[PDB]
């Protein structure tokens, strides 16, 4: 199945995610930082696999530039989430054929280099399209 | 298809060069198992997502160890934690930029106390193309808990 990024929007036969502007969660308690990608995913088929968590798992790689390497970023988990419940409460739940839900995906930052959102077809993780974000210009929310 | 060599203490290919730091044993004291550790300074020579250290070792390196009747293929090791070697393992999965060099470390599960051979083989075919040997007797050995 084929996949693209159109401006600010991921596009596939099965779904479209609108990438809201990402930002840092500064987890002040354990001096760790995450990058958070809010998104408005709208399901285009009826398919139990179409939950946001397994979308991101299935089709998205985040990486972050660094002095000698290009760093793959791990999935982030937050101690609690009263804060973002509005955007996470459906990260596990399937999306109805016509409908749109809010999702948010967290990755564990390491460094301060620019970020790349990559997109890859289901099986193969060769990057098919990408979007980059200047780190310097991302807004940063504490915890 | 791509060609490969060992020059002294260094691996050489069109895509990269690894410097083989002197290897050594991790004695995992908790589960009475030993590993051989190859620290390395890999420097990428192309731009290529496949060029991460893990998949290099996988793609191009066989370790073996001599034994009384056989010559033993050594498995890939995994350590319980790795605060200890984070310096050398944190990038084992990540790609290396066209001109840059990163520290990698590859662990193999020892079986026996025979001498070690590092073999090198082209991408597809695993016929050894070049090799280096290390006398086991003289390797330094670092514990763990």
From TrEMBL, chain A:
Keywords, alphabetical: Signal
Presence of keyword Hydrolase: no
Highest taxon listed in the record's lineage: Bacteria
UniProt keyword Signal present: yes
Domain DUF5067: 1-121
Protein name: DUF5067 domain-containing protein
Natural source organism: Staphylococcus aureus (strain NCTC 8325 / PS 47)
Residues shown, of full length: 55 to 197 of 242
């Amino acid at each position: 199945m084929d996949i693209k990024i159109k401006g600010d929007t991921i596009v596939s036969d099965k779904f479209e995610a609108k990438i809201k502007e990402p930002f840092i969660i500064n987890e002040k308690d354990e001096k760790k930082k995450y990058i958070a990608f809010k998104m408005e995913i709208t399901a285009k088929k009826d398919d139990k696999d179409l939950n946001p968590s397994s979308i991101s798992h299935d089709y998205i790689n985040i990486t972050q530039d660094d002095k000698n390497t290009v760093n793959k970023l791990r999935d982030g988990y937050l101690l609690s989430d009263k804060k973002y419940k509005d955007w996470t409460e459906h990260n596990q739940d399937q999306i109805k054929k016509g409908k749109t839900a809010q999702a948010m995906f967290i990755y564990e930052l390491r460094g301060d280099g620019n970020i790349n959102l990559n997109v890859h077809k289901y099986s193969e993780d060769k990057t098919v399209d990408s979007k980059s974000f200047k780190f310097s210009k991302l807004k940063t929310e504490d915890f």
